[PDB]
Design a protein around this ligand. Sequence first.
Ligand code: ZN
Ligand code: ZN
Length: 85
Amino acid sequence: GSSGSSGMASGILVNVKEEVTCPICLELLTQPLSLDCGHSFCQACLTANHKKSMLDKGESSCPVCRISYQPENIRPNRHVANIVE
Ligand SMILES: [Zn+2]
Ligand SMILES: [Zn+2]
């Protein structure tokens, strides 16, 4: 009458602090995206932000500098479908 093989919950990790932070959630930016302005953001925070400025004006833009560009068809610094094994 027993079942459940859960590995040790040692989520401890020894690494340096993070410098790249998200101007939205202000938490952390490990795999942020790149825009035509330079400022990075979360692949999610960006999607949500865009909607925000959709009911007021309609068009989205950098929530930091609000530069002129296309929030669609944007690619990050590096996009490779290669996962180390
Ligand atoms: Zn974020
Ligand atoms: Zn910007």
